[PDB]
């Protein structure tokens, strides 16, 4: 955190305005939350998106097996993350 100050960029989308958030390794999904209730000023649930399909995020497994497809792609930069109340 003051010592804070390979990063997972996550690129939140909510009702159409975008922007990106990076955290530190490893990423806690209690982090992600609090970190979205705290900048959205409320809270909502987070769902991984391609062009094709949205899959919610419920845990820290959820979370580790989609940084996993952001790790093995070489195209992708960030995290797409779709925020819905
Ligand atoms: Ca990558």
Redesign the pocket.
């Given at each position: 955190g003051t010592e804070n100050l390979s990063d997972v960029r996550i690129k939140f989308e909510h009702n159409g305005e975008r922007r990106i958030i990076a955290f530190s390794r490893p990423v806690k999904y209690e982090d992600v939350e609090h970190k979205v209730t705290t900048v959205f000023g409320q809270p909502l649930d987070l769902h991984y998106m391609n062009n094709e399909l949205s899959i919610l995020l419920k845990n820290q497994d959820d979370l580790d097996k989609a940084i996993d497809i952001?790790?093995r792609?070489?195209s992708?930069?960030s995290l797409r993350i779709l925020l819905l109340s």
């Open positions: 952001l790790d792609s070489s992708m930069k």
